[PDB]
Amino acid sequence: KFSKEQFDYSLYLVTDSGMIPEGKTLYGQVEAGLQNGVTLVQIREKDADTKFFIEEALQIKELCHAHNVPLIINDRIDVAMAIGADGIHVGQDDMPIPMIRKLVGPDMVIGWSVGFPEEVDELSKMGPDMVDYIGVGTLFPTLTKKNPGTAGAIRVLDALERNNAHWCRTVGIGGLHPDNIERVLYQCVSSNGKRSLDGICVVSDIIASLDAAKSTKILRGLIDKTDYKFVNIGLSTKNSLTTTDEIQSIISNTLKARPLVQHITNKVHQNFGANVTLALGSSPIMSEIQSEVNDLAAIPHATLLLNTGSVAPPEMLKAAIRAYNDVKRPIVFDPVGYSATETRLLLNNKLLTFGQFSCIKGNSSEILGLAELSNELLIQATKIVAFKYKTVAVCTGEFDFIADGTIEGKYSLSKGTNTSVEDIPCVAVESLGSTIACMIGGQPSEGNLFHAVVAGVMLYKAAGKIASEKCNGSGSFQVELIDALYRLTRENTPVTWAPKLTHT
Amino acid sequence: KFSKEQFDYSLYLVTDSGMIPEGKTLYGQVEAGLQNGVTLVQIREKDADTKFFIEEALQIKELCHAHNVPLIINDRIDVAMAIGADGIHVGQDDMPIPMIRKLVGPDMVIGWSVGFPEEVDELSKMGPDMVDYIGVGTLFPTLTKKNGTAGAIRVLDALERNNAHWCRTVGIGGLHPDNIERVLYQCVSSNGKRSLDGICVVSDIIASLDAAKSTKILRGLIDKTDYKFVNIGLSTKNSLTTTDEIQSIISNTLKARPLVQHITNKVHQNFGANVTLALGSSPIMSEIQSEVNDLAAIPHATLLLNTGSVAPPEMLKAAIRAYNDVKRPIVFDPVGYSATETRLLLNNKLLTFGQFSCIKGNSSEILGLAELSNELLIQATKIVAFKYKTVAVCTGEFDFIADGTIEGKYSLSKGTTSVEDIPCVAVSLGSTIACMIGGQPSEGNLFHAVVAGVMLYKAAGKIASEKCNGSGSFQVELIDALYRLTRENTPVTWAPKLTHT
Amino acid sequence: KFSKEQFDYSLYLVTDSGMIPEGKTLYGQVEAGLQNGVLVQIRADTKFFIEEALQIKELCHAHNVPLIINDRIDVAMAIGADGIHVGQDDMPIPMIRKLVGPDMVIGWSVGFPEEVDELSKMGPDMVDYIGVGTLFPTLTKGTAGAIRVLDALERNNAHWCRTVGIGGLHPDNIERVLYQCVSSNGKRSLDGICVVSDIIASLDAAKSTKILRGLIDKTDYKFVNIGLSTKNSLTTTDEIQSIISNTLKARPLVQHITNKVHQNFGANVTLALGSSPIMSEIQSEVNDLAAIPHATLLLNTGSVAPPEMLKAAIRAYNDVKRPIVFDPVGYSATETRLLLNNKLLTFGQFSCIKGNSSEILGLAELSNELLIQATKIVAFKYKTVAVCTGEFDFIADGTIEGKYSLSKGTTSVEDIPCVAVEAGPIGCSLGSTIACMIGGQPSEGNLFHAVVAGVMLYKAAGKIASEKCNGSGSFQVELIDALYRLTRENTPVTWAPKLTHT
């Protein structure tokens, strides 16, 4: 007999009877996963046949108790009481929670499927020893649930905090696999940094596995690690303004490394973007072809730059983003959208679920929108975004603001960061997408993501003043800008450049 | 809040959500059936979201309680406790009964689906306030469940051998107005002490375009008490059949020229039509489905069934029903029966299609039908006669006739008069019996007619065996004797002696 | 290197690559069949072919058995194969002989006598052996037909040409095939048996083969649980008396499969002889019926019953070694009837065949010496007791004590026992009579005597009836009566009919 506080939600295995590979049993899989992790187990399915259910539940309760792990049942509350189960899970469309509590009485864990903040409010108006934990929405798409992102999970953890539901644990569920578990753990944190997921739920990743022991050992590895080094550049927090000597080193490195920068964009920017890249002494590639994507990313110092409202299918954007994250190379997200039209908002939010971005760059509107929300406002927004997507965020305007929300790539269960939206580093400065892409692209393993982005914003802003002076209108401004970028970097003398870098 | 003994199983409505006609609601149907009968109601939901289930259950509990009728739930015991239901029904493959009792505690009705005696034994090894009632097997075939009366009797018999006095019974599966009275009529304990406490329907009310009317009809049938299944008298006669009665029978059939439809082999086709001709009535050898209703509509029509025939079960079913609809007599003369695995199968299936006026077999045919010397044969003959609520004939040295119709009486739970004490007397035959019964007027008597037939046949037999030179001439002298014997009604003359058994 | 005369055609395994069960190889199957019996013939890409052929030639040579190839003559020469098989639509035989040169065995698929003629006007060291037609139906690509071919091999004196039977051969019909596939002159039979699916497609090829071996090198086919001994002494009164007693005491169950005219009249004859008739034409019942003591099958023709069920019934009785009597209402009366009847004669072994002058001459594939010759031909052809009804009834015994052998083969058409039964100038009635006499016999009985007993009894009842009757009508019933009276007093010394030798 376990109690609320003895429950370890770390790796939470939810079974599904009609998904087991031939020559393997449900007992067999659940056994393998207990010997290698999963501090919790839930039985469903049916095939019901309510009597065969009960026999399988008892058979499996012995196994779990043997390994000192609780057994949860869904959604048959009666079978739960009948076999002396340790808890029950119910969905939004199952028996109302109060009714359940009345039958099972205190002591028993009650799990609830929750996908929206609105449902966290209800959960809260009910107080403790009603809902004990919740499975957060369906994180990613999946074939396991017969009918039916991290941004969405955050909105829920945030409601658990605004309502101070201290008594309610959380696990994330739906489409969780080794290719996205660290990213999920990493960016699913309360905005105030005080709360994260207490564990991870899998079904197909273990159950449907030809080797369930191995699959589980892998998920365990990911969950009890603490670093997500998502790009082969330094992520150290830097609080000292970026020195002239550092900017100089950045530019040298990218000039010497000749980074390959893959542009995925519409057209207007195709040509102008390739010019900026050429000026910065690196080679542009405008491939939007799925098969090439893994080969491109394999080339030394490769970099991805994303634009939006593009002619490329979501299936390939997903493919590209993943391709770069697999080789730990940097992605820069520069929405041409974003939230400009209903259709763009949709596509952009879908993009932000495909992987981890090294940098997100927007203007005042693009940024406020991303922050889900003047001058003090733009700063708050910039940090919110940076923290939300665990990335370096740039907000362009008269002043350009840069915030570093990577937190050295740190994640943990429940904790969650050690660091809220409010107190991450954010500095100020008084085509940019490709500039930033080239600076980050050139950095070696010992580099620093944040300094590089700042370097880029400085460089760009510097070239701007020069061009606006030497030009005769919009036309020549464009070409004088490219020229300034070229001249500026062929002589590393940042001590010279106009733009002033302050703290925010 | 109801208790075990307040439950009225009379007309028990079991719902099914995805079977309701367009423009009609489950509330709507269940309402109509409460206003006209349904004395009990069960709700299912194997396919929905457990929350919509609970909302519909409460919505419908108010309706039932409003009409002072309990609400039963299946098989979600949890939903049952949660909404304060009055009982739960579970199947053979659902949660074990002891476990259920432990959660819901005494006071709540527990129903169990039961199809075999073996399961009645288990029900009994558990004693009272475990299983309160049972739904007996699937009586007839149906499209309602996703995966006969003889069979129900075997279950009622086990409820008696085990003295499970505490357990009610309802019959279920394929019950409609075309077979409800026959079900109530023949589903009785062998000792006559127990019958079905009620009848269960799903499609007959739920899937109805006019649920109010459909229900009013089922009610009519359930609380009636007579099943006059043939337009002949069914009165119990304890006085031996007098010569004057036999004489009247023969006269009637000669004057009525009954049309006797033979469904038979090919050996019996010809020989059977001869006997029919001799008795002054016309044979027809139609095995065609479309003709069957027209044939039966002809005055004094009669059906004679043989087995191991080339005719499809679908048409036998069609014929048997055709005659029962017009309340005309069927005689069942198995050429099988239980002679081969295939025959046993077909015959038992036949006995589920309708009500027979008479069943005729030899020592083996009969013992088999009784599901079991010279005393043994007598016990067997009554068993059969009572089982199929019919007049049963067992041919041999002595021919035994038993009358198990019990004046066509049925009731709920009661149910009666046991196997042991129905009337039984002692003394080609299929066709003879068919013609005697065929000729009887509304005021006649089924039992006397059958006896008359057996007498007549046995009489013609002695005469023929004497006037013949072997098997060949015996056959034709028998037909002749049948002809001569009936053209002069003088039963005072005939050889065969009629005693009590 | 083998030569013509070292070739043992006993159990001849023909492979088929795409028919092997999972987890089993062609090497695996052919190995199992060599260790338990087995000559061998092999039938994708021409290069994989050659590799498999060599691989398998080593195996065969290891067990001292030749390897034959079909129909790639080139692959044959290339791998030094021991012989080649070709079909009727493959390379002409002379051409083949020219390329492979003498010494190599040449097999030819043959299904008609016409093709035996061609095989013959080519003389020796052209065609060495032949696979006879397709005996029974099969998904891989009758005995009366095989006989016509063995007969042509004899009329042409093709002494140099062996024969194997092929197509649909399995344990349920191998002995019957060996048993009735013999030259009309009795001098020639099949030199062996060919299987594909029975061994190749088997989950246990070792066992399957051991079984086929058992059957082939046995020599008795006891196809009915009655004596088959050749009796040359006329059937004595005391024997007829014993027969009738036995059937009266045994009350045989006689299953009639017949028209509708004969249904009733046939059941009466059966009843009179103190046995029970059953008129079932239902497939599922058939195995249960035959399992009942002293059960007997009587077949009529142009019936409403499907060939699929007749096959089912005939087999059902042969499996329990009970007697079948074949009394064609056809036969050869119409094109459709001939067809169905011949198909029936391929379904199993009959204990007796009964026809009239036409029915019989037809069956013999052809007066009074003529009728006698015909009757023996039929009796011998279908290895059965044959009855030919007329003024004289002729009975011939072609069972030859149920003896079979490879190549040998037996005793010709000409010299099996044949007797006659006359009484003076006077149908489906005799069929039922015969069915009841045979039905009653115990293991120690004798098939031949019983049939004769039946014919005598019937003929006897006939004279009596023709005298006591007033026309066709009463004749029928007086006949049943006479059958009844005659058997209730076993006094054959009394009966009119005279039994002579033919």
Ligand SMILES: Cc1ncc(C[n+]2csc(CCOP(=O)(O)O)c2C)c(N)n1
């Ligand atoms: C703890 C908890 N939270 C939520 C639910 C509902 N739920 C969300 S998606 C899905 C399966 C995805 O598996 P996968 O994609 O790993 O194959 C299910 C069963 C539940 N039953 N338990």
Ligand SMILES: Cc1ncc(C[n+]2csc(CCOP(=O)(O)O)c2C)c(N)n1
């Ligand atoms: C009291 C009780 N006994 C048995 C069962 C199981 N059951 C067997 S047959 C049938 C469908 C017949 O519909 P129809 O009358 O339209 O043929 C169902 C529901 C149950 N659920 N409740």
Ligand SMILES: Cc1ncc(C[n+]2csc(CCOP(=O)(O)O)c2C)c(N)n1
């Ligand atoms: C020696 C010889 N004779 C004939 C043929 C032609 N042939 C007639 S039937 C048959 C397949 C029978 O398989 P199963 O016994 O499984 O029915 C084949 C292959 C030949 N290729 N070789």
Ligand SMILES: [Mg+2]
């Ligand atoms: Mg169930």
Ligand SMILES: [Mg+2]
């Ligand atoms: Mg933009």
Ligand SMILES: [Mg+2]
């Ligand atoms: Mg549900």
Ligand SMILES: [Mg+2]
């Ligand atoms: Mg009978």
Ligand SMILES: [Mg+2]
């Ligand atoms: Mg004939």
